[PDB]
Write a protein that binds this ligand. Structure first.
Ligand SMILES: Nc1nc2c(ncn2[C@@H]2O[C@H](COP(=O)(O)OP(=O)(O)NP(=O)(O)O)[C@@H](O)[C@H]2O)c(=O)[nH]1
Ligand SMILES: [Mg+2]
Length: 166
C-alpha cells in the first residue's frame, strides 16, 4: 500500500515519543524514557485511503545529530515539535527546520509546526507567536496534548495530506 515516511523531530523531552505512542497505542506515557531512535509502522485509513505510516521517532539529544540526519534524509513529512511551556524548545525549532532543509535539499518539504502539551497551564509560548512562525514557513501550526490526545490525530493526518498535495 501507500507508505508515508513521517519523522518526528524536536528538542529533548518536548513529547515527540508521547505523541507517537498516543496515536498508535492510544495511551499517554507519562514517563521518562528518552529516545535514541524508534520506528513504528501502522496500517491506517485516512480519508478512505488505506496507507501505512512508517514513523521515525527521533531523539532531541545534541550528541546524536548525524544519526538524526541519516534518518531525517528519508522523511517525506516532518513534525517539528516544541512544548508550549518550554521557550528554549520553541527557540530550537529554527535549528531543526534548517537542518531538515539542508538534509532534504528543499525549502517546501511537507511539515507541521506542533506546539505540544497544550494541556499544561504554564504556557510560556503564546499561540500567536507560533502561528506567525508557521505563517513565515508556509506550513500549518497545530497545538497538541499527548496527555489528552487532543490535536494528535489532527497533526499527523494533516502532515499526510501535506504530503499528498506536495
Ligand atoms: N502534560 C503533558 N506532558 C507531556 C505531553 N507529552 C509528553 N509529556 C511529558 O513530557 C516528557 C517527555 O516526553 P517524551 O515523549 O519522552 O519526549 P521526547 O520528545 O520523546 N523526548 P526525547 O527527545 O528525549 O526522546 C514525559 O514525561 C511525558 O510524559 C503532553 O502532551 N502533555
Ligand atoms: Mg522520545
Amino acid at each position: 500500500m501507500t507508505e508515508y515516511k513521517l519523522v518526528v523531530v524536536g528538542a529533548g523531552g518536548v513529547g515527540k515519543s508521547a505523541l507517537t505512542i498516543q496515536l498508535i497505542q492510544n495511551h499517554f506515557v507519562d514517563e521518562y524514557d528518552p529516545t535514541i531512535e524508534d520506528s513504528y509502522r501502522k496500517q491506517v485509513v485516512i480519508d478512505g485511503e488505506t496507507c501505512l505510516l512508517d514513523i521515525l521517532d527521533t531523539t532531541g539529544q545534541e550528541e546524536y545529530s548525524a544519526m538524526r540526519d541519516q534518518y531525517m534524509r528519508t522523511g517525506e513529512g516532518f513534525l517539528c515539535v516544541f512544548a508550549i511551556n518550554n521557550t528554549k524548545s520553541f527557540e530550537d525549532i529554527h535549528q531543526y527546520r534548517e537542518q531538515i532543509k539542508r538534509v532534504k535539499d528543499s525549502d517546501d518539504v511537507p511539515m507541521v509546526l506542533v506546539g505540544n502539551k497544550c494541556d499544561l497551564a504554564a504556557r510560556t509560548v503564546e499561540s500567536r507567536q507560533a502561528q506567525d512562525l508557521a505563517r513565515s514557513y508556509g506550513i500549518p501550526y497545530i497545538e497538541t496534548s499527548a496527555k489528552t490526545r487532543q490535536g494528535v490525530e489532527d497533526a499527523f493526518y494533516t502532515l499526510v495530506r501535506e504530503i499528498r498535495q506536495h
